[PDB]
């Protein structure tokens, strides 16, 4: 349901606005730390000059960037957004890619392996129905990607004024090679993204992700998983969560609720220079797997 694509859907960047591509009002996202934001609250109001096309360019060449997109909701202000529309309606699970000057629906998870889509944004649903959508990009991207969202207010009319059509284009350039960590496996995508693979039937080497200051770690957890003490209750062999052990580290997908990819990532800060040797575990339902994390050995 949330991930349902319509293969027959077609649109264009300009939509039905009659604006040629040379006349788009292009601008960049408001980038702060690792959060790139395209806010349309003030951009799409009905204007005399409208309909104008306003394109927000999200250019990503770094890992673990979070993209927030704010699209004003119908009725947030009376009359000004009465006929607003957003595309795809199943964003961010569904995005638009350019195929022959045409935009068609594609699953974002198949475009970028490892992409984290949380179910909630600020404890509201992660859907344009709540006005905001978010997704975190992975620590590794191999092929360049370009996908689009639409937040179109051009059909809204107020006296002689008309709203504007909003376009967000996310441009991901390649970055990274492999993720320091382990993939518990049963595609080639699962095998090539992590430095160590752990097979279920006959394993010799348990999970050993070796981190240093500035490095990114990750774990692809087994599909069948009961619980894990990994990154919240860790055992030093030299304040038990990794956050408490490494001040200002960040763990992505703490709650393991992201769709598709059962992964969480860790970022060791460049400041952190002390040495640490930790243990956590992964429980299956059916045995359990041991995880050894070393930092700055």
């Amino acid at each position: 349901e949330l991930d349902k694509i319509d293969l027959s859907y077609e649109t264009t960047e300009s939509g039905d606005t009659a604006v040629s591509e040379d006349s788009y009002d292009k601008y960049a996202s408001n980038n702060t730390n690792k959060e790139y934001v395209c806010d349309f609250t003030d951009q799409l109001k009905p204007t005399e000059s409208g309909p104008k096309v306003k394109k927000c360019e999200v250019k990503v060449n770094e890992p673990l960037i979070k993209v927030k997109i704010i699209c004003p909701l119908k009725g947030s202000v009376e009359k000004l957004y009465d006929n607003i529309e957003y595309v795809p309606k199943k964003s961010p699970y569904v995005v638009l890619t350019k195929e022959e000057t045409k935009l068609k629906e594609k699953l974002l998870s198949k475009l970028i392996y490892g992409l984290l889509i949380s179910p909630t944004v600020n404890e509201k649903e992660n859907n344009f129905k709540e006005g905001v959508i978010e997704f975190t990009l992975p620590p590794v991207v191999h092929k360049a990607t370009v996908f689009y969202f639409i937040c179109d207010n051009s059909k809204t009319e107020d006296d002689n004024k008309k709203g504007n059509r909003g376009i967000v284009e996310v441009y991901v350039e390649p970055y990274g090679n492999k993720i320091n960590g382990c993939a518990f496996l049963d595609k080639i995508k699962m095998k090539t993204f992590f430095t160590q693979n752990i097979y279920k039937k006959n394993n010799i080497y348990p999970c050993y992700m070796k981190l240093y200051s500035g490095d990114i770690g990750g774990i692809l957890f087994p599909k069948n998983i009961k619980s894990t003490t990994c990154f919240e209750e860790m055992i030093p062999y030299n304040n038990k969560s990794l956050g408490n052990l490494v001040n200002n580290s960040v763990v992505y997908n703490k709650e393991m609720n992201a769709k598709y990819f059962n992964v969480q990532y860790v970022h060791i800060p460049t400041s952190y220079k002390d040495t640490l040797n930790l243990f956590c575990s992964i429980i299956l339902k059916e045995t359990s797997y041991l995880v050894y994390v070393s930092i700055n050995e």
Partner: single-chain antibody
Amino acid sequence: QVQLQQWGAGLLKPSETLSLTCAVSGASFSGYSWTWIRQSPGKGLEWIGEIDYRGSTNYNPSLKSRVTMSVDTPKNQFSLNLTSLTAADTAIYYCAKGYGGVTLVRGAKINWFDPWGQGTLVTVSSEIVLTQSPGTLSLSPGERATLSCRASQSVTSRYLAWYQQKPGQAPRLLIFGASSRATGIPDRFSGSGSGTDFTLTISRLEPEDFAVYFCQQYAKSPWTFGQGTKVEIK
């Protein structure tokens, strides 16, 4: 209402340093590639380099040694510094707004230049090659003009633009994507072609349509122009 104010010292001795600055208004300084372009007598149109709001640069390999560009994003300005000046650097320098659109084609950028600045004459005194044919068309009003632009190597996609330069003015964009009319461009201007062969067709000439027409490719950096085709009366 995109305006590009341009200023800088124009009368310089050899070996001195040229410094031009351009100020943007009516457009968001983020989201375009602010470029410099010069038009020299004989040499023709030449792309110098580009810079965005983040400070990232791309320079022409020919001028790469002597060219430096900067941005002062607060004031929405960007600047050029050409060094080791010679007489061959005498030309009209244009501030220009490059579209700067992203493409999955490598080495390519959707980077036709529109609008251009008014131009600054700099006087020194004390690759994909596009070949346009003809060099000169002599025709009367109401007749059809057909111009050709041929590239030394295939232009990926249809990443070609055409420009019109009326006498005494800066170029203005006519066509982008080989065959897409720009905003405010009459229907009598039609573009066509793909690969290495492109044409610009002016179906029913009118007295002001007598200008110089250039093609530009943005499929492989450095962005290059044709030598021009002059359209005149007969």
